[model samples]
Target chain A: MQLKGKTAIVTGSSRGLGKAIAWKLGNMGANIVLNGSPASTSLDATAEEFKAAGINVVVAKGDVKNPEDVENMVKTAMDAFGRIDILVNNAWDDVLNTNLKSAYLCTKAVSKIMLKQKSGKIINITSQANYAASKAGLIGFTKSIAKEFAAKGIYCNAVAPGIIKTDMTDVLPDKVKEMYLNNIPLKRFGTPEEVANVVGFLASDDSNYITGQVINIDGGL
Target chain B: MQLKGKTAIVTGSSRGLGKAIAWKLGNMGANIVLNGSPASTSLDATAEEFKAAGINVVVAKGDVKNPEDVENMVKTAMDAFGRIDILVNNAWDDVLNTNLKSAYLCTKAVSKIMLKQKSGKIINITSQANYAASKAGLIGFTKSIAKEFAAKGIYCNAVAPGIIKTDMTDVLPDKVKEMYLNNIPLKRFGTPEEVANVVGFLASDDSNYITGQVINIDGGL
Candidate 1:
């Protein structure tokens, strides 16, 4: 594990994309602060899953959109690890407040600590159509932060995943699935694990020169 | 003018992105291959426009989906310039046969010559959501070509323009445009010239190391 001594904060990691990212970072030997929805998904099981894997795990359950809660989430990480080396902003709702603004809030909360350390890696996960004003705003936020924090050794980049075959797709109507299929050239959907592989790449030193860019992981969409 | 003396083939150059790519390449002092659809967008005026600008322009009228037509298109370029230094596959069709498959056909034809020459640039143009199976195939096609041709000095990349203002959009209803506007964080549709500028960058030396990427020029999308 090249990341043996690092600590990471992965927001909204109880399940789905966030969970996969947290698992990946932890696999690389970083101590993980696994953030779960304040009242939705339970942290009990997922927390144990990490612990069973012999991973260093910390659960910080809170509503990402709530400023006080987000602050506490960071504080929880600080208390567990003393410093944050990598932060994965992976929580999102279909709405602006929950998806976009929350990412900014969490980024704000950790920017101070990261700046103090003069070294950090921040990766934001958004939809492939990350074009909706709020979603697109995340791209702008990513680039600006990348430029602003480069001198401080803080690197930021965003990943946009398309039509992954999740439980969300399980409930989707056949027509919706067909429509998505028609757009993808690979004639298939991606796995959360595949998306996590990319997240892991961005978090590692392999992507040191690749800040300020939004890479699409959509099977060539 | 950065591309002075280079010879470029821009499929479907009679109008839209193909036209913009042709114009920009010509302005850069490259001898341009201006292609036209067999039945649409007369190449008459556009060809004259390039000639009027003192650009070395060759009009190759053909159907990109037809193997014989594509072969003749390349022959026309070879006959005119003796070598194909750059190929901008920027034709428009709402279907797979004409859009995606045609790109494969044309790329296949040029790759042989580019391989012989040992160096070339190929850029495919599509929308950021470039999701239509045909459109999306271009990305897959781009990456494969990039991998297969990299050692031969042939670089392949794709550009995804976000809501560029064109006659293509003029037919859309106000609500459609508004929906697009709402999605763009910049709150405005991009101009074709802006899209052309990015195409120009990719076609120039500034992007030598970049390959197999579908970059979006979506004002933060």
Candidate 2:
């Protein structure tokens, strides 16, 4: 694993994109910290899978919006793995917490720790939904923060998923689904693993000089 | 003026990029509503410049972070010109309100009105900082919001300025200035008017199919 000996905290890793990222990084020999709204069977199942693969696994459950929860989450990672060399702000979709805001809060909290380490990678999972007014704010936020922290050796970047097959989109109205499918030039929804590959790349040294950028994995949508 | 009957509201138009956008659009025949932080002399001067150009101008001074202020600014445009056809969410900064959050707040407020009209253009001023993890949130935000608003007949897009020669960089230390200049493929800073030209293109029907995209005006940086 390119991430061997590193520790990563992936919020909302109980399932979907977050889980996929955690699993990929774990396969590469990094200790994984999986975070979600609360401890649950899904979180355990994912952790056990990693454990079976001989990857060190820790589960931290909490709301990302609560400062206390975020602090404890970081502390738990430190207690389990001594240090955090990678942080993926992959939390998503809580009530009153838009995907954009969740990413922002998570990045803000993680940046402090990364700054101190003088070496870290932060990946924010962003969606095609963030392409509009409410979500567009993240682009500016990412840049300003990146500029401030570049000299500190903390790299920040965002991954934008196009149409991906996830549980969340399973119940979409037929017409809505059709409209979305038609818009993707590739004419297909991406597998979660495909998205995971990009995340793994960003978390590794392969992207050293490529900070403050977004890679669109939307199959040309 | 090319925009003879068009009406525009440019947030943070007191000085810098916003003011340049207002002047360009106003010269093109659009009636201009200039918005800026209250008590800033730059705002007053910009409005005066627009008025001198024989364009109808209204000053809507307030912070872009306040929803009420944004709503009132838009309302002022409607009251003075009887309708609003363009909105440039150009007010931004890394200080005071983080650039990302301020841009989002302004977009959220302006989008409501634009949606009602069903025939309006919104141009968000984004930055290259939006690409790396340290600052790339804005790219994700712009993409998601663009997808959400496309069907509403309201187009949304962003202009990513490279290194621009503005009052902001006028007094930079020699080494710092050189470092920035060296990064641009163009080997020079862009003028505010050059950035405004792209905005003018998007605001018009010429860019009808180009929603949810970003145009980097940074001489290929």
DockQ of each: 0.03, 0.27
Tens digits of per-residue lDDT for model 2 on B70-153? 778877777788777887877422431445556667677667777788877878786433333213445556667777888888
* Runs off by more than 4 Å, candidate 2: A1-6, A20-30, A38-55, A92-123, A127-221, B92-118, B127-153, B204-210
Each model's fraction of native contacts:
0.00, 0.43
Q: Alpha-carbon error at B181 in model 2, in Å? A: 3.4
For residues B43-110, what per-residue lDDT tens digits would candidate 1 score against the true structure?
87898889999999988888888999999999999999999988888863447676777788889999
Candidate 1 ranges beyond 4 A from true positions: A92-94, A128-131, B1-221
Model 1 CAPRI rating: incorrect
TM-score list, all predictions: 0.53, 0.75
Highest TM-score among the candidates is held by which one? 2
Q: Encode model 1's per-residue lDDT on A1-221: one tens digit a residue.
A: 84788998988888888889899899989999998776754576888999999999988888888898889989998998899999898862457776787789989999999999988988988843434776788889899987677656687889888778798898889898888876665446778877776777678754444457787766456
Clashing pairs in 1: B1-B28
Chain A, model 2: TM = 0.89
Best model number under DockQ: 2
Candidate 2 lDDT by residue in tens digits, A90-183: 7412321555556666677777778778988887776433344333445545556667789998887878787789776788888888888888
Error of 1 at A27 (Å): 0.8
